[model samples]
Target chain A: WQECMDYAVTLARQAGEVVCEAIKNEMNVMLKSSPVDLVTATDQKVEKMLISSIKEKYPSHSFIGEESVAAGEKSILTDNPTWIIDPIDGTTNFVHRFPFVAVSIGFAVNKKIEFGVVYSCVEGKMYTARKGKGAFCNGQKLQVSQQEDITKSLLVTELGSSRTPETVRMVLSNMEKLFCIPVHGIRSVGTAAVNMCLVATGGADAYYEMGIHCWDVAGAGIIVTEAGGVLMDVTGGPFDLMSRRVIAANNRILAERIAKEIQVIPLQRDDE
Target chain B: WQECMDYAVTLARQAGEVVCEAIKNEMNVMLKSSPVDLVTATDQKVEKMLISSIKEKYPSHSFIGEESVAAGEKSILTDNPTWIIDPIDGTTNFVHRFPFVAVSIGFAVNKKIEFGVVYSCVEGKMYTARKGKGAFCNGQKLQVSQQEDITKSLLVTELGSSRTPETVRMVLSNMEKLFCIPVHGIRSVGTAAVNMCLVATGGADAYYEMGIHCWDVAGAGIIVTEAGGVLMDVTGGPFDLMSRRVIAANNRILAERIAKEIQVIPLQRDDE
Candidate 1:
């Protein structure tokens, strides 16, 4: 796990360089599954770089990537040694040059994430973690903030892709409930990977987002839990990588605090 | 105007250097009136540096600063040539080391912003504009994205410091309405200057926020307008520097699209 974690960091850096170069030279971005959902030449290039390099060293490692998944690769999570990677999370931010884009990679075996890495290439910050060994950011040991109060905690939350025309109000109502949670502040920076890393490092106290995917959190999920945080379904069940709605926080206490109120949506009424 | 704009960029870079230095070293932050509204040693230092340097150069220029206003300086915006400065526009983010912080400076002649500069120190990117000239990020000229449709517009909005506990739900309700507007995406990175700059540079289609102070948007608002965007009050009125609720967009059409819906306080229902 340690070697794999080290390799994840190495691989992330290499992938990050590709992203940074594309970001510098400019990118040719286009709509992916939808107009709002974006992808770029850099995204494909970086993911290909990550996948091919990892295969050379560990060919048997099964993989899940954003582009591949969008291209109809199996989106299922398996209880095998699998690598989940989002070469460039926050594609919109990347295209906008907002500087919140990141490279996220997670290594899961037997349905458990054992190690992961998320690197914000623009800021040159790297977060890495291995199960039992703990998580780190930019070479510093990470610790989840012990803030127990909701009104005082800074939060990172998001409005996800699952929002439909009919469910727009449902999403907004849930977000309204979230906004009324009386936290110190709430931010949606459009990058789940970096948001998870921020929670793991205590910069933000909590993060809740619905309709994400395995490739988004598989890496940061390990990083968060190893830093003494908790990541799970808003319903107090185990995280279903396929379902993708997650609430990650500094501790179980905070996670439960948000979980008790976070609205789960099925594109219907806002009534919880 | 060009000379002043150039000087704004130069002074912003200098102030940005100071901010980056303080951020590199851990900052000594303190709450101003509340925990959510923060002030730091660097904010005071940078603002003082900005005031003295500008005063020596332009003695007749009036000034408005966050620290001074907090210390009971009259928060007045005059028709005189004035420099509006927020040494650190995202103070909470700065305290958290969230890296969305910026040095924002705006020069207003007769209460009309003629030139401005917003420099995100960490990113080393500067946004500048002079009246009737244009906006620039780094060294490249900027133009608002030709995107005219609301469904494809990436909107940037914020939850500000002025929300009352009783009005939290109202604010949330308003946010809910905003979220349901069928946009490309929504993001809140916690910096008015950066959000405005991002909008100015066509990275985003719009920005709407209430309770933002004049210093926060003075710089970036000019950048937005210079980039072919519009900066106006959400109520279809002139932008009130004192009122501070603003809707800036890629064009008047998009500006009206949001302004027509964005509301003021007092717990409104979300059933629009």
Candidate 2:
């Protein structure tokens, strides 16, 4: 099991390196749904490389990928072994060379996340975790911060699309209520996966976001949980990769409190 | 003059290293002014070290420091050479180990900024610029991004005590208007000096803030100007280090348009 996880880690790091090279070469970029939504030719190039490499090594394993799904392709995860990947999370930050994006890959078996790896190519930091084992960053065992004061804690927020219009405003209102207590600060780094990784590494005390996809949180979600953090849906229930938006922290108590504070209303997707 | 600037750079780097070490140790954190405002023991320790070093090297030079000024002391920058310093520009980031803070030191001669240096000890990046020699980061010359559209460009903001009362609301209102165009995103990193350095390095296309002090902007302001970015008061005039409450982007045309769209009422301070 450790060997399989290690192999996935190596592949994730390689995919990250490929994306880094493409970024260095100044690959052609284009918008996806809007100007704020961006993708580089390299995103497709790197995603293709990742899929093919995984297929060649583990032909029996199913694959799910972001760019592929966008192209009307489907990769489903079942009780059998499956690999979930975001070849380049934080595409906007990557396009702008902000050095906060990462290559994320996760493996699950029997409908449970088994292991995951996230490699930040720019900083050359690889974070990995295996179920019931432990999380590590570049071989150093990771531990979430033990800070208890939610009011003074550093919070990481990921701004969702207009599809979840009220999410940021709800957070802002909560921040106003806690203004007197003086939260450490709030950051919006524009990437859910990297934000989760930061929480795993003790950089942020809590992370809350609404309307994230499985590809955006799967790898780092496992990492955060294994690093002694709590991952939960905004409804204050267990996090299910396919279903709900998340509010996560280093501990269950904080996670519960934050989740309670995140007022969720029914989201209206135009297609829905 | 170059020798003086180099000495200041060396001192700034040394101070930055000391503060970075303190940040790693996470010792002696205390709240100041507000919950978000943090002052670590290292801030004072670094400021003391900087003051003593500067006095030893240039006994006749005037010194103004944030920690000292907040202690009911006054520092005046006049026709004579003076050193303005913020030992740790992003104290909150440093306290939380976010790696965005820096030690900023600027030199003024005859009431004009001659040279400035801002060093990010965490990232090992040093930005330096003389009045006319141009700006460089880590020995490589820097230039602002060529992005012209405010809608498509990245905007950096800061949240301060004053932000809630009126300043941030006005800016956000203006942003809602500009949201109709190509603006891509808004980032508030909570550090004025680092934000200015980012602007100079093209990490951000524009930055606007109100109620920032001279010490906060002095070092990075000169660096941004020399990096081919525009720096001005909110009303489209020269940036007055002492009195202006509004600061805009380094790009002149964009700065003017932003100033026109945002109505920033001049703030009144009892101290003034």
Candidate 3:
């Protein structure tokens, strides 16, 4: 377990140095399925590098990454040891040179996420967590802000260009309802990993998003829980790594409050 | 004009060193108007420092800052050589240690923005622009991205917790409409100045918002225009410094499209 954890840490750091480092003078930004769904050359190159490197170290482990999944690999959480990765979680932000992009690495076994790491290159922040070992940002131990008043909480979520009309309506309606309670503010910072890290580090109180997959939040879910936060399902029921709709919060009460104030969303469908 | 520009540049950098510097330590966070509106000791301390230093340099110039406006000064902008400043834009972000906060310094002559600077200390980026001189980020010349297609563009805006109910409804309605068209993505990064700077630097193609004050965007407006972006009136006609409904975009057509989609709000009243 320790060796695997250490390997993931090394992977996260290497991603910071090599992957995020690829954001230089000019980028070869390209459109994917649509204009809104962007995939940089760096994303593919980095994911390939990560998988190869990890495969060399742990030849028996299965893997799921943004590029590979799009190429035809299955998207599932399995009993076998699997590595879930988002090489560049905020691709739009990366192309825009917005400095909010990060490398998300989440390793899972069976239904439980064993470890997660979110490495932001420009900011030099390395947020890592090992199941029960707790979370840490940089070298310091992390904890969510003890802001109980939902009205004063600052939050961030994702508004991916996925699912077009239905996703748009669901997020907009929920956002309107959430803002009616007038929580400090809600931000769509583009990266699910970074937003969850922010919640872990107490930079924001909550991050609720629909239309994301395991690779996106698998790394962040453990980080939030280890940071003394809640990883609540956006809709009710038990939270799982594959639960596509999620609301990570500073605490469970706040998460439940948010769950009630906003409409609970079903999992984002792959076909949508 | 050159001397005034020099002073603003110095002030902007100084603000980064001092105000943004204050963020390095533990913040003495407090609520100003309500639980949603956050204020920090660094805000007042930095505003005083800026006013005093700039006042010593240009004693005859008028000044309008967030602290002053919140302290009950009138909202009408003047034609004098006024310095519109936000000591720390994204105060809540700073208080939360999110690293998106910035120092915004704007210089206006006869109500025309002559010079502007947005220095984000955490990011080590200094964005500067003069009326006819052009815009720059760090040492490189800046220009808004040439993404003419709305669907291919990255857009940013702010949705503060202030002026709730009606403002909330209007913003949510517009967001739903804009995303229904499937614009690349929508981000509310919590800083109006940084969003405009992103547009100016070709990071994001457009930024549209209501409820932001001159101090929040005055500095970035000049940067946008000088970087080959447009500052369009949200309602219509020529845009002035005090125009509450503002849309800064890479091109006029994109701005107009966004303007039509979003509700052009009236100026925010103190009572509201």
Candidate 4:
């Protein structure tokens, strides 16, 4: 277990360095499924590098990456020791030279996230955690905010490419109810890993997302849980890394509340 | 003029310090109008401090502050020397400990915004500029991004409030006409001043806001213009310091295009 953890950290760091170098030079960006959705050659290159290194080191371990995931992939994560990676989260922010993105890597053993690492190359900040071992940011211990009320809390969420006007309307309606007291502010930082880290470090009290991939949340989810926060789906169930919808918070109360509110909204299907 | 600029810089720094101190201590926060609308004692205290100091130094100068403007008070600015202040732009971000808020101060003479200053206390970054003197961030010369085509540009706007859903919908709808190559990405950093500064520093290609105040844009407006960018109303006319709407971009062409597209949306009269 220790060997695998060490290998994951080393590989993650190397992949992060590769990304930083790509950013330092120039990025070759390309359109993905939509104009709003972007992918870069560096993203593919980094993911390839990580996958190859992992395969050479531990051939039995499974790998999942944003660029390498096959079509028709199941949403449920497997019980085997699998590596999850978001080679570069916040691709838009990165391409535009915004410094809020990070490289995230997580390891799930027997369908449970065991440990994770999220490295922000721009700021040289690294966040890591092991199950029951607690979380750390830049070698310093980390913890979720202790604030209990919703009115005084700061919430973070993402507006993904799949978002619709209805989804936004639902958020606004819920905010109207929650805004009076505990929900003072809401932010869309355009990065899932960073949002999770913010909750883990108490920078934000809670975060919820209607759409996200496993690579985006895996590392930060473990960090938040180890930092004494709660991680769950919007329905108040345990977070399914393979699931595209999730809500996370520093405490169970806020997580459950957000989940319950979101459940009432009728889901909107995008034909495209 | 140089002395006034120096004094403005000093006051802005002092106000920033007060805000940082407030963040370190427990703050008294409350909802205003709606749950998303937040007000903190520190905001008032900072505004009061800035107004008092400005009034004392330049007693003949006109003053406008977010907290002091009464409901019936005239917000119009004519040919007079006016000091515009948003004691804490991005108050929600500040309250959340997000470090993107700032003490923004802008000085206008003869109804023309002549200089502006935005001091980010958490990051210890001070961005300043005078009409023809050029923009500076922490004493380093700043420049707007040189990206010409809208397709390669990175745009930023705000979301998470009642206005966000509509704004996002409008932007998404417009994305259809801008197909293949219009905007590379869009972001909402949750702070107007920070977004403005990002434009000044070439971190973003453009920024647009439908509902904002003189205080919010005063400081960053000058910074963006001095950095060789353009600031204007959605109609492509010069931005009125007293108005509550604006579209700013690194170039006039993009600014006009963005504003024209946004203007087609039916304005929400209720908020006004």
- CA lDDT of each prediction against the hidden true structure: 0.81, 0.76, 0.82, 0.77
Interface RMSD of each: 2.5, 3.6, 1.9, 5.4
**Model 2 lDDT per residue over A33-140, tens place:** 776777888789888988898789788888778888778766455887878888898887776665667898888888788998888888788989999999998999
| Candidate 4 residue runs with Cα over 4 Å from true position | A1-14, A53-59, A70-76, A147-152, A163-182, A263-272, B31-36, B70-78, B146-153, B160-184, B263-272
- Model 4: CAPRI class: acceptable
Across residues A1-272, which tens digit of lDDT does each residue of candidate 3 receive?
77988888888788777755677557777877876778878889889989999999899999989899888887765688989999888888887777778889888887588889888876778889998898998779988888888877787877655646776677777777777677777777789998999899888999987778788888888999999998877775567566677889999878888888777555545323
Instruction: Report the candidate with higher lDDT, 3 versus 4.
Output: 3
Estimate candidate 1's alpha-carbon lDDT, on a 0 to 1 scale. Answer: 0.81
lDDT of 1 by residue, B108-179 (tens): 998888888899998889888888878888889988877787776788888777546555655666666666
User: Which regions of candidate 1 deviate over 4 angstroms?
Assistant: A1-11, A17-49, A94-98, A133-141, A165-167, A237-243, A266-272, B1-14, B21-35, B264-272
Q: Estimate TM-scores for all models.
A: 0.86, 0.92, 0.92, 0.85
Model 2 chain B is weakest, by summed lDDT over 10 consecutive residues, at B173-182
Local accuracy of candidate 4 as per-residue lDDT tens digits, A149-176: 7656788875455434565456545544
B-chain TM-score of model 3? 0.94
lDDT of 2 by residue, B22-136 (tens): 7767577886776556788888889899889889988998887889887776866678888888888887777777667888888898888899999988888899999999999
Screening candidate 2 with a backbone cut-off below 3 angstroms (N, C-alpha, C), the clashing residue pairs are B151-B182, B151-B183, B152-B182, B152-B183, B229-B250, B230-B250, B230-B251
DockQ per candidate, 2 decimals: 0.42, 0.41, 0.61, 0.33
Misplaced by over 4 Å in model 3 are A25-35, A268-272, B24-34, B268-272
List the candidate numbers ranked by lDDT, top first: 3, 1, 4, 2
